[PDB]
Amino acid sequence: MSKYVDRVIAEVEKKYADEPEFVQTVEEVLSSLGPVVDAHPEYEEVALLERMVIPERVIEFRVPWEDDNGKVHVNTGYRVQFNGAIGPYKGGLRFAPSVNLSIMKFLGFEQAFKDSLTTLPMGGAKGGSDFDPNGKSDREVMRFCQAFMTELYRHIGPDIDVPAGDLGVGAREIGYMYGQYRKIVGGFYNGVLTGKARSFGGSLIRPEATGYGLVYFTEAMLKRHGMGFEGMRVSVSGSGNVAQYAIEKAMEFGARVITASDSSGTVVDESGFTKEKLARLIEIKASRDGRVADYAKEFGLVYLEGQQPWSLPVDIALPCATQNELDVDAAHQLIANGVKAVAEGANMPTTIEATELFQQAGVLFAPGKAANAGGVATSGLEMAQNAARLGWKAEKVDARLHHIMTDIHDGSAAAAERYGLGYNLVAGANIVGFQKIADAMMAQGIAW
Amino acid sequence: SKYVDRVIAEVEKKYADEPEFVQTVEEVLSSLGPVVDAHPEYEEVALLERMVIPERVIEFRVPWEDDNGKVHVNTGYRVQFNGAIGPYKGGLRFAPSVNLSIMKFLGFEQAFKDSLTTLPMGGAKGGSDFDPNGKSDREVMRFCQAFMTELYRHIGPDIDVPAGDLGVGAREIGYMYGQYRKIVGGFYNGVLTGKARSFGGSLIRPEATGYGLVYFTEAMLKRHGMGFEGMRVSVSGSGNVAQYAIEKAMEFGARVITASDSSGTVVDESGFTKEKLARLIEIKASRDGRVADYAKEFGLVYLEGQQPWSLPVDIALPCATQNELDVDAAHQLIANGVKAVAEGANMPTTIEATELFQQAGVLFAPGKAANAGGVATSGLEMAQNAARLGWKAEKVDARLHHIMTDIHDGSAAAAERYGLGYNLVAGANIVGFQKIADAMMAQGIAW
Amino acid sequence: SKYVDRVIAEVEKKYADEPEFVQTVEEVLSSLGPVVDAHPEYEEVALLERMVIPERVIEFRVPWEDDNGKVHVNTGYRVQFNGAIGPYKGGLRFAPSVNLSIMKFLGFEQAFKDSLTTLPMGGAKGGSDFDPNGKSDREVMRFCQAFMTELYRHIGPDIDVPAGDLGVGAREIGYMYGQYRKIVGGFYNGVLTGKARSFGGSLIRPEATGYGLVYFTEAMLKRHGMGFEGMRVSVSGSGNVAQYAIEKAMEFGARVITASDSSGTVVDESGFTKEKLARLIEIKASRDGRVADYAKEFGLVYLEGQQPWSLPVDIALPCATQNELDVDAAHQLIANGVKAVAEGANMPTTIEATELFQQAGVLFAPGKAANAGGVATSGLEMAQNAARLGWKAEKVDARLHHIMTDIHDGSAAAAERYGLGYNLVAGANIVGFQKIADAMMAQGIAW
Amino acid sequence: MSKYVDRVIAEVEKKYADEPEFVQTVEEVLSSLGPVVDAHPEYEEVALLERMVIPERVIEFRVPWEDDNGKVHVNTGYRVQFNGAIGPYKGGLRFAPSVNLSIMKFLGFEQAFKDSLTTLPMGGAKGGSDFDPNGKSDREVMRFCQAFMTELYRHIGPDIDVPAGDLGVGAREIGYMYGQYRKIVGGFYNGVLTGKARSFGGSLIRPEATGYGLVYFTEAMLKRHGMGFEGMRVSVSGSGNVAQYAIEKAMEFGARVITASDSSGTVVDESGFTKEKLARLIEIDGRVADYAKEFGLVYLEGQQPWSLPVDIALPCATQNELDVDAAHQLIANGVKAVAEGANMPTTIEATELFQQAGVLFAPGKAANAGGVATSGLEMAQNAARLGWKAEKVDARLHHIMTDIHDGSAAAAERYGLGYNLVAGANIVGFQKIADAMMAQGIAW
């Protein structure tokens, strides 16, 4: 019951009042699951929701370290192992001074479901430190990592906990942490972390992953309704990681990607992007202050200061820039111009009010939580070193990523079709994400 | 073998209190006499004397609380019989009968069957004298939890992977894996097979034995130029084995014209169809759901207490129980011109009826090899958990198939090598023993 | 000390939502200003900034099952605060009010009582928001098991050694130990303290606090002329602390004249005898017999609804609860010229009572150091367990005596010293802190 | 070249004076990395080299044992865990009375680069004992092996360090060792070892591996240059493991192999080898001249096969078996490519002339790494946990050899050496290790 759901949300808001960021995330997540909790009288008989909201295991640890001048600092370290029903705990590490339990708990709670979402066996967890990488030297971050990892190693492993990057943790940090890991444990065990370099491998397709996968996912949404990217007008916002590779894949399915935006303006390319065009576009978005305004003028294209792409007549709309970048009166123009599909590349670009609108009437709509997910999936593909094999030549990793995206779509639809709907992919994606944990947790008994 | 004879005797005297074990030793060794004969090195390293003593046996007290808060006491068992070719493997059994003797005979056999499949599984059996009979879902949970609190230390993905058996299904697994993951603090889902899909169970698990039986007989058939296409098939039993034999049988072109419960046989002669079989599954899926109900619903014959061996068929797939096919049925099938019989249930044909199935030269597939798609796929489960991927239903099935054809090809036809003609029984049995003898020798005298 | 003030301030900001802990770092850190000033080295290696963050904090889920089948879930805590001078030590609290703030404040202070003892014990505190109140004998069991099923992987005789507190008694510790033994498969009975005699508990444990109190005040009393010999003593409470303070004072020729419960004080002008105590212990352990029945049975004086503080005496030992010897009552004592007050109970002296008590110049042994009987003999338990045999009461009692004495001495000794003359508060604080600081200085960064 | 390299080489010549073999290897390795170390000033900043030349971990241990007569002997065992950045420690074990730390360290050091050179995630290490298996009974090797593993088991494992075979150690000892390993650790964990019997984890194509890869590699080389084995006349020296299967694979690529040799002499079949001719030879006890008679084929005593005009030359016999004068005839006669099945069959003078034609040359370091690649394949199978058909292993071995070629050719290319396989083979071996040590920081 949402009687059940509502009452848990209550206790949490009281009990964890001083952990705000986590309280909203519990609320924002458990209130989508009403109907599903409804279908399953048995959940509350075994106190499922109550158990799900308390992490399995939480670790906090002192992290003393020394700067390049020999001053000794001390930060707190965190690894919240939220849920391990459907795999080893998985989730990134975040080194940022805001980092606290509440934040690690909310990130962790979410990671659980996004992990289940992928269909690969991955748990839910987050971790990090108030350590602030800002203006730290390499050596200093190296040493911070070493200390961090000196305590963390005992709680993780290829079969226990596989952490990754995030805010302030990248392949550089990952490699230092690993360096220390194997120094201590005494063997290879490269599965203990994802995000690694290709040398101790380290998966190909990882930078591609998130954007490649947005296109893969929407090709499937397009499949169920006898459409495809093939010769369709695609408009894209953003110009970072997702967008670069959104465009790349989009243009292998033979679409005509006509836009790319940044913080300032939008580029419009009637003929659509090509390999040479896009490549140069990257070179400029890697040379701050290289602006998309320059790409336009260098190539002789119309640019649009202060404007988003959404006023463009397109078949497919792919927002991969920022949150809330696509508002009610942007979907009004998009729909009016005959938008067929809209899919989320960034993190929650479409506003709630513009998701209604697209959803009824017409318009497909891929939710980012499922649609972006490529990166989250290929972390699971990095594990597949358990295979102890020469990564995969990238075609082999792309193929898998392609199939995986297809399945997150397939089962995301099936989830709704299941609980009285049909192509609400939003409720995808919620359910399925929760269903998999749920079922595992029911099967495993009253232990965790 | 005067050697084989001697071991058998020694075991008879030493384990007299262990009849089922003693029995399964003579029953198996007596068959390896030609093999042992050709390998005079075996006696030198006391091979047989080693193989019949299990590497390791663990027994343990299992205290638990029922729903009334009353304390009970059972006994857990895990007999890790032979770990030479893979990590110990074999199922768990909860039944009041259970003791060392039973645990050991199932375990010894497990070794050979696991070896047969050509996947790197060893051989072990386990369980408790706990009795799932009229215990609450929850009672069974507490017992599985108490069971695993001791057992976890002896088993593992690389060490000993148990599974389901009499008394133990995905419900019992799952409760067990859960207590296990809670104690060790890891995922390591490769510790158990027969799991639910959500934490690493395999697709094709439900359908494994059935399918595999069809894959195997097809292999037996196609080596005698025949096949399932357009052939008349009869199936006894209406459980999971029978269900998926039929599903595979018709996928191959076959026409399947029977099924049964301990109530009676049902005849269709237009053959089952996907649509037709789907309902039987539902009906026979509890409760009181009977075969006649399936027959009525489709206006098909229902032989009240008889079994399907009367009907003339090209191929016969017994999937009911032990001894369900004696000399009576044997002559009938031979008379009516049966081309092949193949066991999906546990040794369903009597020894006497394996006859002289010699006559008419009837193609014969022993359960030992033929009903082994379940155990072969537990390997496939083990392998997927190792890859930390899930394989599609297609993938798992394509490899269950390739396996089964191999269980046939080399496990029957050598045989052959030792000149027993075309004797799948003895020729796939030697194949099981050989892989273990091979590896044990290589590994010297430690175990 | 500015450094101590900067750390304090920084702490108030970062852990504002953790009041108890902020207040406790404040209380404790602001009394070592001198020590820190005598040691610039500490700031060079950020000793204070390190000491306030526990080395390792564990939270875990604890699902458990009601006597009638419904699932509850609580949260489990273990704060391993400091392990420089030994294995994490510190009890476990089971109480609905528990949280990290509380576990942190208790842990932090436990590092110091612990160090204070001179035994190799580090500091930690733990428990659950579980509430034992209204929970059956067998629900506590099932909970303890679920609790330990996680906790075991973080503790052990050489790592972290929990004990009791609020909601954790010999009962709860036995259940926890039981589960530990079953999970890890050995004895390792040094993993907990507060154990029953049968599996490694310690003789002298029940008497630890009250015996220790007496021992401590004696050393205090000698460095200032006198001793319990022939002195008049007032004790409050009828507990293990009370009873055994009376017991040990009598062995020092003292004349102990009071004892109380929630319903008043008993006055015995002739003093407690060894027979008189025995018969009071019998009673006050037998709900619902009370202090009164002890009086009416011996024709002693009974002051209903009041405390032994108006009673003229040389020596007052408050052994009941917190803030039980307050402001206006602190005067009577002083009026009647009490020479020395020593607290066996937990912070029974109001921050006013300790005006101060000198002012007056009256000897004062703060509970921090004086009631460390139990904390010390728990170290003795760990000890005997490691030795694999059980010391006689005489022997534990002896070791407890030299320890307490060593506690006084070091607390006065390096504790002056430093300036402040004979201040047993502060002293107790500086020696605690000192040992840890030295050990942590010796082993570098990190921890 | 560079001064950073010369310095370290000097430092090592000094400290490990009594470890001649080691020192030879280090100077022989670091000498050829001049351009790489030059192009990376970040190495020296964090003291690469100086680290790399010290083995991460070294284990030595007493190995007491009893012979068939009750006599206690006592030998010394070694496991040098040289480098572990790119995979778990990996390398064979040697049983020979010559064995010491100097040898172990040298073999181990090269091993780490041969492994990296392989693209598979395998580290570097060598191991063994001064035990001498000659004139020892089966049972004495078994009991020694057990004594050996009773100590060694604690330092290795599927994830940690995975030994294999070498001089003194074949499947027989690998089994005895694994036997004791599992008796002690009490799980399966095959993959602790390689060179196993197929019955408890071994791989198919293992016997084939070296020789196949030799052919796969050079055929990659040839494609890059618009050629292939198909149509060509090919000469082989030696007639053992590598020799045999080099001919089998070559034959399958449609090439006419027209020679075979041994410590004695050569056979000349200008009509070419056939599946069946290659069948007889193999002979054991009995030499090549015999197979020449049994087939009426022209035999030549004492002399090598290099005087025959061929399109490809495949030395698979010994060290320094291609001298200069030989290399001169070869070139004179039209040789288009030469490649090394053996260990260093070509001298630097003869390698020099070849690359100074005209002539495509595949360094044995890359070209004979078939068995090292397929031993990493065996680890992969054991992880999987299934066997792969002989055809599957081969397909994968085929691709890996091509990668080895591409990666090598690409590395010489990056550094402007423009298709010198010899130099690239040295560089990608160092490069991968270096990249990973750089990313893992200062810990090892």
Task: Assign 3-class secondary structure to A256-291.
Answer: EECEEECCCEEEECCCCCCHHHHHHHHHHCCCCCCC
The whole-angstrom distance between residue D39's C-alpha and the CA centroid of its chain comes to: 29
Task: Round to whole Å and give the CA distance between D175 and D145.
Answer: 9
Is the Cβ–Cβ distance between C236 and C307 less than 8 Å? yes
3-class secondary structure, A7: helix
Q: Are strands B301-303 and B315-317 parallel, antiparallel or unpaired?
A: unpaired
| SS3 of residue C44 by DSSP | helix
| Alpha carbon distance C211, C205 (integer Å) | 10
Determine, for residues D142 and B444 on separate chains, whether the beta-carbon distance falls below 8 Å: yes
Q: E-strand spans in A157-239?
A: 161-164, 233-237
Q: What angle (nearest 5°) sits at the alpha carbon of residue C228, between those of residues C223 and C234?
A: 120
> D58 and D31 share a domain?
no
Residue pair A60/A76 in contact (Cβ under 8 Å)? The answer is yes
Give the end-to-end CA distance of chain C in Å, rounded to a whole number. Answer: 24
Listed residue (D376, D326, D173, D129) closest to D317, CA to CA: D326
> What gap in Å lies between CA D214 and CA D234, rounded to an integer?
13
* C94 and C13 together in one domain: no
**Structural domain contains residue D381:** no
Alpha-carbon distance of B203 to B211, in angstroms, equals 13
For residues A259 and A309, the answer to whether their CB atoms sit within 8 Å is yes
* C-alpha span between D241 and D256 (Å, rounded): 19
| Cα distance between residue A263 and residue A283, in whole Å | 17
Determine if residue B118 is labeled as part of a ligand binding site.
Answer: no
How many angstroms separate the Cα of D280 from the Cα of each of D150, D239, D244, D245, D273? 43, 12, 11, 14, 11
What burial class does residue B51 get, using C-beta atoms within 10 Å of its C-beta: 0-12 exposed, 13-18 middle, 19+ buried?
A: buried
**Is A114 known to sit in a ligand binding site?**
yes
Radius of gyration of chain C measured on its C-alpha atoms:
22
Sheet containing B255-256: order of strands: B255-256, B232-235, B315-317, B340-342, B363-365
DSSP-derived 3-state class of residue A433: helix
Separation CA D380–CA D121 (nearest Å): 10
Residues annotated within the binding site of C for substrate are 89, 110, 113, 164, 378
In Å, how far is A96's CA from the nearest CA of chain C? Answer: 15
Rounded to a whole number of angstroms, the CA Rg of chain D reads 22
Q: Six-digit token pair at B40?
A: 């005079």
On whether residue B231 sits in a domain, the answer given is: yes
Q: Using the beta-carbon criterion (under 8 Å), do D180 and B382 form an inter-chain contact?
A: no
- Non-local (6+) Cβ contacts of C322 within 8 A are C345, C346, C347, C348
Q: Is the Cβ–Cβ distance between B321 and B241 less than 8 Å?
A: no
* B326 Cα distance to chain centroid: 21
Kindly state whether residues B46 and B57 are assigned to the same domain: no
Co-location of B327 and B433 in the same domain: no
* Same domain, residue pair B107 and B256: no
Angstrom CA distances, B413 to B406, B408, B416, B436, stand at: 11, 8, 5, 18
Contact present, C56 and A61 (Cβ < 8 Å): yes
Look at residues B254, B250, B357, B370 and name the one whose alpha carbon lies nearest to residue B314.
B254
Which 8-state DSSP code applies to residue B189? G
Q: In b/e form, how buried is each residue of C110-147, taking b as 16+ CB within 10 angstroms? A: bbbbbbbbbbbbbbbbbbbbbebeebeeebbbbbbbbb
The angle at the Cα of A183, spanning A137 to D24, to the nearest 5 degrees, equals: 100
Rounded to a whole number of angstroms, the CA Rg of chain A reads 22
Q: Are A426 and A409 in contact (CB under 8 A)?
A: no
Contacts of A131 in chain C (CB under 8 A): none
Backbone angles phi, psi at B364, to 5 degrees: -130, 120
Residue B123 lies in a domain: yes
Is A194 annotated in a binding site? The answer is no
Closest CA to C366 of C31, C7, C54, C5: C31
CA-nearest of B122, B141, B127 to B60 is B127
Q: What residue in C sits closest to A130 (Cα-Cα)? A: C14
Q: Which of A338, A337, A335, A333 is nearest to A360 (CA)?
A: A335
C5 and C47 within one domain: yes
Burial bucket for residue D391 (CB in 10 Å: 0-12, 13-18, 19+): exposed
Distant-in-sequence, close-in-space partners of B176: CB < 8 Å, separation ≥ 6: B92, B144, B145, B147, B148, B192
Residue D200 to residue B442, Cβ atoms within 8 A: yes
The SS3 of residue C258 is strand
Instruction: Give Cβ neighbours of residue B443 (< 8 Å, ≥ 6 apart).
Output: B84, D175, D176, D178, D179, D182, D200
CA angle at residue A293 from A288 to A296, to 5 degrees?
A: 125
CB within 8 Å of chain D, chain A residues 165-194: 171-172, 175-176, 178-180, 182-183, 186-190
Is residue A365 within 8 Å of residue A316, measured between CB atoms? no
**Residue D295: C-alpha distances to residues C208, D246, D261, D273, D279 (Å):** 100, 21, 15, 11, 12
**Residue A14 CA: distances (Å) to CA of A29, A319, B70, B201, D388:** 17, 37, 38, 39, 58
CA distance B252 to B211: 11
In a domain, A43, yes or no: yes
- Which residue is listed with tokens 């010699």? B358
Tokens linked to A248: 């790349």
Pair of tokens at residue D405: 């070629």
What is d(CA C210, CA C191) in angstroms, rounded to the nearest whole number?
Answer: 25
Pair (B427, B359) in one structural domain: no
How far is C-alpha D319 from the chain's CA centre?
13
* Contact in structure between C57 and C113 (CB atoms under 8 Å): no
CA distance A368 to A346: 7
DSSP string spanning B48-80?
Answer: HHHHTS-SEEEEEEEEEE-TTS-EEEEEEEEEE
DSSP state of B360: G
Q: CA-to-CA distance for A239 and B73, rounded, in angstroms?
A: 67
Choose one of B340, B371, B402: the last residue of a domain. B371
CB contact under 8 A, B386 and D387: no
Which of A153, A188, A223 finishes a domain?
Answer: A188
Cα D267 to Cα A76, D252, D283, D303, D328: the distances in Å are: 75, 20, 14, 10, 21
Chain B residues closer than 8 Å to A84 by CB: 181, 187
> In three state form, how does the secondary structure of chain D look?
CCHHHHHHHHHHHHHCCCCHHHHHHHHHHHHHHHHHHHCCHHHHHCCCCCCCCCCCEEEEEEEEEECCCCCEEEEEEEEEEEECCCCCEECCEEECCCCCHHHHHHHHHHHHHHHHCCCCCCCEEEEEECCCCCCCCHHHHHHHHHHHHHHHHHHCECCCEECCCECCECHHHHHHHHHHHHHHHCCCCCCCCCCCCHHHCCCCCCCCHHHHHHHHHHHHHHHHCCCCCCCCEEEEECCCHHHHHHHHHHHHCCCEECEEECCCEEEECCCCCCCCHHHHCCCCCCCHHHHHHCCCCEEEECCCCCCCCCCEEEECCCCCCECCHHHHHHHHCCCCEEECCCCCCECHHHHHHHHCCCCEEECHHHHCCHHHHHHHHHHHHHCCCCCCCHHHHHHHHHHHHHHHHHHHHHHHHHCCCCCCHHHHHHHHHHHHHHHHHHHHCCCC
Distance CA B379, CA B117 (A): 9
> CATH no. for residue C433?
1.10.285.10
**Which residues of C are documented as binding site?**
89, 110, 113, 164, 209, 240, 378
Which tokens hold the place of C193? 């303290």
Q: Which domain holds residue D285?
A: 208-368
Per the CB < 8 A criterion, the answer to whether D297 and D267 are in contact is yes
Query: Could you tell me which chain D residue has the CA closest to the CA of A187?
Result: D160
Task: Give contacts of B83 with chain D, Cβ < 8 Å.
Answer: 182, 187-188
Closest-CA distance, C130 to chain B, in angstroms, reads: 20
Tell me the H-state helices in B266-305: 274-283, 291-297
Burial zone of A351 (CB within 10 Å; 0-12 exposed, 13-18 middle, 19+ buried) = middle
Beta bridge partners of C261: C264
D114 is in an annotated binding site: yes
Token pair belonging to B29: 């060794």
* Four-residue CA torsion sign, C192, C195, C201, C206: positive
**A236 touches A246 (CB < 8 A):** yes
Interface partners of A (3+ CB pairs, < 8 Å)?
Answer: B, C, D
* Cα angle for residues B283, B286, B290 (degrees, 5° grid): 50
Distance CA C83, CA C73 (A): 30
Give the pair of three-digit tokens for residue A204.
């190909």
**Are C167 and C105 members of one domain?**
yes
Tokens 């593992």 belong to residue: B156
What Å distances lie between residue A1 and A418, A438, A446, B46, D7, CA to CA?
17, 15, 21, 66, 75
Q: Which residues contact D435 (CB under 8 A, 6 or more apart)?
A: A197, A199
Report angle CA C439, C440, C445 to the nearest 5 degrees.
145
Sign of the alpha-carbon dihedral angle for B357, B361, B362, B366? positive
Chain B hits for A88, CB-CB cut-off 8 Å, are: 186-187
- Using DSSP, state whether A75 is helix, strand or coil: strand
CA distances from A16 to A21, C79, C127 (A): 10, 19, 18
Is D107 domain-assigned? yes
- Burial class of residue D381, CB neighbours in 10 A (0-12, 13-18, 19+): buried
SS3 content of chain A, % helix, strand, coil (to 5): 45, 15, 40
Give the rounded distance of the alpha carbon of B419 from its chain centre: 27
Distances (CA, A) of A441 to A112, A448, B148, C229: 13, 8, 17, 67
Map tokens 């004998």 to a residue: C137
Which residue in A126, A277, A369, A436 is the catalytic one? A126
Q: What is the resolution of this structure in A?
A: 2.7
- How many whole angstroms separate alpha carbon C234 and alpha carbon D302? 114
Kindly state whether B137 is in contact with chain A, defined as any CB-CB distance less than 8 angstroms: no
Alpha carbon B259 to chain centroid, angstroms: 20
Bridge partners (DSSP) of residue D158 are: none
8 A C-beta contact, residue A110 and residue A32 = no
Annotated catalytic residue, options C2, C104, C125, C284: C125
Instruction: Choose the final residue of a domain: B337, B355, B371.
Output: B371
- C350's CB contacts (< 8 A; 6+ apart) are C323, C325, C326, C327, C330
Q: How many CB atoms lie within 10 A of CB A105?
A: 26
- The answer to whether the CB atoms of D436 and A188 lie below 8 A apart is no
Task: Please tell me if residue A268 touches chain B, with a CB cutoff of 8 Å.
Answer: no
Is there a contact between D123 and A171 if contact means CB atoms under 8 Å apart? no
For C42, the enclosing helix (H) or strand (E) is: helix C41-44
Q: What are phi and psi of A283, to 5 degrees?
A: -45, -30
CA C246 to chain centre: 18
Residue A413 forms part of a structural domain? no
* Ramachandran assignment for A363, one of left (phi > 0), alpha (psi -120 to 50 degrees), beta (any other): left
A195 inside domain: no
C123, C352 Cβ separation under 8 angstroms: no
Considering only the beta carbons, identify the residue of B83, B383, B442 that sits closest to D197: B442
Q: Please tell me the distance from the alpha carbon of residue B445 to that of residue A378, in angstroms, as a whole number.
A: 46
Which residue in A38, A6, A8, A118 sits closest to A419, CA to CA? A38
For residue B241, the domain's CATH number is: 3.40.50.720
Instruction: Please calculate the CA angle A97-A102-A103 and round it to the nearest 5 degrees.
Output: 50
Tell me: do C222 and C357 sit in the same domain.
Answer: yes
Decide if B183 and C149 are in contact by the 8 Å CB cutoff.
Answer: yes
**Residue A90 is labelled as binding a ligand:** yes
The CA distance from C171 to the nearest CA of chain B, in Å, is 19
Q: Answer for the pair D244, D291: CB distance below 8 angstroms, yes or no.
A: no
| Chain-centroid distance, C-alpha B405 | 17
Are A328 and A435 within one domain? Answer: no
A407 touches chain B (CB under 8 A): no
Catalytic residue at A277? no
Number of domains comprising chain B: 3
Which residues is D300 bridged to in the sheet? D266
CA distance C175 to B164: 32
Catalytic residue among B13, B104, B125, B296: B125
DSSP codes joined into one string, C169-198: -HHHHHHHHHHHHHHH-S--TTS-SS--GG
8 Å CB contact between C340 and C364: yes
H/E element, C217: helix C208-222
Establish how many alpha carbons lie within 13 A of residue A68's alpha carbon, considering only the half-sphere containing its beta carbon.
8
CA dihedral A132, A133, A138, A141 (to 10 degrees): 50
Same domain, A324 and A436: no
Q: Report how far apart, in Å, the C-alpha atoms of A317 and of each of A235, A310, A383 are.
A: 5, 8, 33
d(CA D6, CA C341) in angstroms, rounded, equals 79
Q: Radius of gyration over alpha carbons of chain B, in Å?
A: 22
* Together in a domain, B292 and B329: yes
Domain presence at residue C111: yes
Strand order across the beta sheet in which A341-342 lies: A256-257, A233-237, A316-319, A341-342
DSSP H or E run through C101: helix C100-116
What is the C-alpha separation between B335 and A213, in angstroms, rounded?
Answer: 63
Q: Check which CATH number belongs to the domain holding B67 and give it.
A: 3.40.50.10860
Angle between helices A138-152 and A171-185 (to 10 degrees): 50
Q: Which residues pair with A126 in a beta bridge?
A: A80
Return d(Cα C56, Cα C42) in angstroms, integer. 21
The first and second tokens of residue D375, run together, are: 């031993």
Instruction: Say how far apart CA A272 and CA D100 lie, in whole Å.
Output: 68
Single-letter residue type at A151: E
